[PDB]
Design a protein around this ligand. Structure first.
Ligand SMILES: [Zn+2]
Ligand SMILES: [Zn+2]
Lengths: 124, 117, 59, 101, 202, 238, 209
């Protein structure tokens, strides 16, 4: 029952997700290098709500860059992408960060009454 | 003034309660379970700090310097070891209104000096 | 009455029970043992005086 | 006297009131309906203004009755409006401000 | 504005901030920061408003009063501003943090929910979440006030439903008891009255 | 309202068998300056002492002195509870109590916990906090009529309390018993009556309605307020 | 401790004189607006020791319409007034042939004393007042409108004009602060004149209960 989410672990001030992992992920369909191999490599970690209190997140790897005034300089994890904070129906809104939030909630409710093809085998 | 601690009997290990000996006109600490008595050495039985003038440096522990989520600064070096980096944080403790005060801790391992500006 | 008393609302029991009574019912009768289990730093009189009413209520 | 009554009614100097008839708008309507020239002398006698306002005040009845209790209740019901009416339909204002015929 | 808030934070951190009468030091610091950021929001909104041309359609609809307000223009062009939950900045829902992306004990404007972007610029992820929090507050208010207000409406109606103007012009209830000797103390209906000025008062 | 806790720094109970040689070293000066002449029944003295330390900040913030405090203690408990104190010159504002004649020490602790809560040094009960300020809006300013006949808004100090004792606050020197009011309509009804609460209730409903800039015709408020007050008591809409 | 005591006594006396004047009792202008220093000259500035004693503060006024219709104002010394004191005051009123009185208590009045004040009403109409509620004249408050006790002829004229029964008028409790100030009993009607923002003036009538 503990809700958690995956995050990219961070070294001293660097991601552990090197370019070799992206390379093996690009040919995911040939070399059967999958998400579980990414987790087993110690590059990704599932962090729950209670362990997030002890975690210092980077919103993007740009936060790990050394800046004229360092904000943290001791990050421990990084977001895979901030847009993953949204759910299924809010992930259909284009440019949801340019709307008033009630509008995004009303769309998230109204994407569910929208017509389409609810399922491919609707004939049976 | 300082607080007064609880003291226990030497036989039943129950707490000693205060009592007065009229014969010598002297304070005693006696157990109401066994029949033990002791000559007090503080003469003070109760202390209430209504002002709550607590030194929060005593509540801090050096281990907090290992917290990745605390801010670090290079501007306040340690007076005990000379390390440059140090974590800082606010009181965040109830019963402390002027809690914007910052407390610093040295991040050098095994030094753990704590102070306040 | 005098200070702040600590109680314990155990299941299947419709009346509050002092914590010291519960500790004694578990085999810890000496007040030293109970505060060894409750207060881990004996250099701290604040915790001590705040637990003292519960001891005074269960003697 | 009406001024002092208003001063005790509205202890703060707030002249905004809610009343039945918009007397300034009716005066403007009369000015435009009869083509009143504000630059020429008027043919309205100030005594006619006084008498007409008094008769009007008598005709505006909220509480009906000649008994003294009905008279006092009638006085009270239309007090604020009658003050507004006497201060708006004043003979001087009707002579040099509105210049009605 | 952010440098001003940083200065106030530095003052508070150095105990160079003394409380004002009627408030604790935390509340005085919060008042100073909120004043700085409200001033920033208003100044930026004025800048956006003066930038508008006569052909701007936001300005057209706001000027006519058809729809919108100058604050909406400011949020679309200049800055969305401070997000509040229960009338205060974003609370420390984590341990001394608003989100895991901030350091502990960060009372800065961006940490506590100041959206320094406009809706055209687009909100950053933390601004997006804080704005969603502030909007959730409005949704909850809209959905929770209705029951209490409707119960108040029903209660008022059932309390006054039979009070009526009678043919003797008195206002009376069903028991025939007198509530007002004349309706509104003047026996006049509320549709025909209107605002005027007493010329002899001031 | 100011209780002894609001102005107290820290309380403590000692076992002082003879006041001449006190347990504390810094309180030996004024105790002997008090004891060299017999002011009270020294024989009816208990060895349990109750020393309270005040703080200069809260003493000055209320213009309070040990004289008033000691008088209040000796009035609330009579002569049964002796209290002594130094002048308002020492670096620490301290005053020492003893009980005159459950065990004694427990009684001292109990009266300590009581005095720190119920001993009203200054102020009116049920009034927690009071804020003095100048009203910038004319609705709270003092609107007078000058000798020339113009309305003039005098900018004067007004107090806003966090509790209500309208009954007591009205009957205070230099307090206006004519304009001083409250938002607790029940107290207005209890103190001023049914027509006063009618008017006050109209004012409060108008304040609630108009605070958002709205406007409602006064006859509707008047009818609601007459419905709640036409039977001589406050008739809730419930 | 003492200057405030005499100040309170003077304020109470001032409110009592205003009250008696509003009830229609003969009160001279001199005592109606009596300065605090004049009060000290006439009664003293040391009530604690016994100058003035509250027994010296007793007032006795006569109605303007009837010189025989007099009224007392007693200031008991004890904070909690007991039934014995009520019996003493009633005895004095019997001796002096006075039928109305006000008792300005300090702390309160015992239940037996209140029951005595209630049971013997048809003989002696004697009322109870706290000194705390006489330190201010509530009729001077801005919220309190102008109350006027109507006469039976006026009440009959009112009910005949509006053609209604007494139970159809709005009500005022007999224990109302202003009803107690004017000393009005059940069956009496009080005319309230208040300013109205829509009509200028408004008169309403409340029946006492
Ligand atoms: Zn023992
Ligand atoms: Zn160090």
């Amino acid at each position: 029952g503990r809700i958690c989410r995956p995050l990219l672990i961070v070294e001293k001030q660097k991601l552990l997700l090197k370019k070799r992992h992206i390379d093996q992920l690009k040919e995911r369909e040939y070399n059967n290098y999958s998400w579980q191999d990414l987790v087993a490599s110690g590059v990704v970690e599932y962090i729950d709500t209670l362990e997030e209190e002890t975690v210092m997140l980077a919103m993007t790897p740009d936060d790990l860059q050394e800046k004229e005034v360092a904000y943290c300089s001791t990050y421990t994890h990084c977001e895979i992408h901030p847009s993953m904070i949204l759910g299924v129906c809010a992930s259909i809104i284009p440019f949801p960060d340019h709307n008033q939030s009630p509008r995004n909630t009303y769309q998230s409710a109204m994407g569910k009454q929208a017509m389409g093809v609810y399922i491919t085998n609707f004939h049976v | 003034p300082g607080f007064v601690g609880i003291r226990f009997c030497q036989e039943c290990n129950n707490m000693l309660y205060p009592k007065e000996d009229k014969e010598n006109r002297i304070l005693l600490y006696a157990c109401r379970n066994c029949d033990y008595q002791q000559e007090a050495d503080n003469s003070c039985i109760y202390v209430n700090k209504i002002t709550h003038e607590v030194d929060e440096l005593t509540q801090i522990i050096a281990d907090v310097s290992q917290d990745p989520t605390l801010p670090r600064t290079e501007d306040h070096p340690c007076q005990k070891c000379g390390h440059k980096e140090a974590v800082f944080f606010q009181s965040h403790s109830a019963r402390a209104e002027d809690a914007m005060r910052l407390y610093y801790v040295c991040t050098a391992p095994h030094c753990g000096h704590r102070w306040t500006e | 009455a005098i200070g702040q008393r600590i109680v314990a609302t155990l299941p299947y029991i419709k009346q509050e029970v002092p914590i010291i009574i519960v500790f004694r019912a578990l085999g810890f009768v000496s007040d030293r043992d109970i505060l060894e289990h409750i207060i881990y730093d004996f250099e701290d009189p604040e915790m001590m005086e705040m637990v003292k009413p519960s001891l005074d209520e269960a003697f | 006297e009406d001024r002092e009554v208003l001063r005790v009614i509205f202890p703060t100097g707030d002249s905004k009131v809610v009343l039945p008839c918009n007397l300034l708008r009716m005066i403007w309507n009369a000015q435009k309906i009869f083509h009143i020239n504000p630059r020429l002398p008027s043919d309205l006698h100030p005594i006619k203004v006084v008498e007409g306002v008094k008769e009007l005040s008598k005709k505006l009845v909220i509480v009906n009755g000649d008994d003294p209790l009905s008279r006092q209740a009638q006085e009270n019901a239309t007090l604020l409006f009658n003050i507004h009416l006497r201060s708006t339909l004043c003979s001087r204002r009707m002579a040099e401000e509105f210049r009605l015929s | 504005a952010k440098q001003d808030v940083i200065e106030v934070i530095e003052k508070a951190h150095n105990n160079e901030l003394e409380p004002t009468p009627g408030n604790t030091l935390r509340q005085t610091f919060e008042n100073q920061v909120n004043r700085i950021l409200n001033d920033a929001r208003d100044k930026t909104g004025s800048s956006a408003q003066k930038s508008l041309s006569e052909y701007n359609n936001f300005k057209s609809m706001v000027v006519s009063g058809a729809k919108g307000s100058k604050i909406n223009i400011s949020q679309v062009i200049a800055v969305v501003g401070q997000q509040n939950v229960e009338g205060k900045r974003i609370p420390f829902g984590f341990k001394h943090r608003t989100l895991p992306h901030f350091i502990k004990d960060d009372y800065g404007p961006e940490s506590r929910g100041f959206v320094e972007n406009s809706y055209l610029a687009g909100l950053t992820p933390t601004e997006f979440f804080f704005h969603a929090m502030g909007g959730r507050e409005g949704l909850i208010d809209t959905a929770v006030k209705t029951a209490e207000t409707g119960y108040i409406q029903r209660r008022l109606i059932k309390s006054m439903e039979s009070v009526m103007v009678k043919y003797d012009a008195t206002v009376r209830n069903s028991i025939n008891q007198v509530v007002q000797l004349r309706y509104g103390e003047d026996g006049l209906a509320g549709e025909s009255v209107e605002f005027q000025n007493l010329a002899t008062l001031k | 309202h100011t209780t002894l806790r609001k102005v107290t720094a820290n309380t403590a109970i000692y076992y002082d068998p003879n006041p001449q040689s006190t347990v504390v070293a810094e309180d030996q000066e004024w105790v002997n300056v008090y004891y060299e002449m017999p002011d009270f029944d020294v024989a009816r003295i208990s060895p349990w002492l109750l020393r309270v330390e005040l703080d200069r900040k809260h003493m000055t913030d209320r213009k309070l002195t040990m004289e008033q405090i000691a008088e209040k203690i000796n009035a609330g408990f009579g002569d049964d509870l002796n209290c002594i104190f130094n002048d308002d010159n020492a670096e620490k504002l301290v005053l020492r109590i003893r009980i005159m004649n459950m065990d004694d020490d427990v009684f001292l602790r109990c009266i300590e916990s009581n005095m720190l809560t119920d001993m009203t040094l200054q102020g009116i009960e049920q009034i927690s906090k009071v804020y003095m300020h100048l009203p910038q809006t004319d609705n709270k300013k003092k609107i007078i009529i000058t000798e020339d006949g113009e309305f003039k808004a005098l900018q004067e100090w007004i107090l806003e309390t966090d509790g209500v004792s309208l009954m007591r606050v009205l009957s205070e020197k230099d307090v206006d018993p004519v304009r001083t009011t409250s938002n607790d309509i029940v107290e207005i009804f209890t103190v001023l009556g049914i027509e006063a609460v009618r008017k006050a209730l109209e004012r409060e409903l108008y304040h609630v309605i108009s605070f958002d800039g709205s406007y409602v015709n006064y006859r509707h408020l008047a009818l609601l307020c007459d419905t709640m007050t036409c039977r001589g008591h406050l008739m809730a809409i419930t | 401790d003492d200057e405030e005591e005499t100040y309170r006594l003077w304020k109470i006396r001032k409110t009592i004189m205003q009250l008696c004047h509003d009830r229609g009792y003969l009160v001279t202008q001199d005592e109606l607006d009596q300065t605090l220093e004049e009060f000290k000259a006439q009664f003293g500035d040391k009530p604690s020791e016994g100058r003035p004693r509250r027994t010296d503060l007793t007032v006795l006024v006569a109605h303007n319409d009837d010189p025989t219709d007099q009224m007392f104002v007693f200031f008991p010394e004890e904070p909690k007034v007991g039934i014995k004191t009520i019996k003493v005051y009633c005895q004095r009123m019997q001796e002096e042939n006075i039928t109305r009185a006000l008792i300005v208590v300090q702390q309160g009045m015992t239940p037996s004393a209140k029951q005595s004040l209630v049971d013997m009403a048809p003989k002696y109409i004697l009322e109870q007042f706290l000194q705390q509620e006489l330190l201010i004249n509530i009729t001077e408050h801005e919220l309190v409108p102008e109350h006027v006790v109507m006469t039976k002829e006026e009440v009959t004229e009112l009910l005949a004009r509006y053609k209604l029964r007494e139970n159809q008028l709005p009500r005022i409790q007999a224990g109302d602060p202003v009803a107690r100030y004017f000393g009005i009993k059940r069956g009496q009607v009080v005319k309230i004149i208040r300013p109205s923002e829509t009509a200028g003036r408004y008169i309403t009538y409340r029946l006492v209960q």
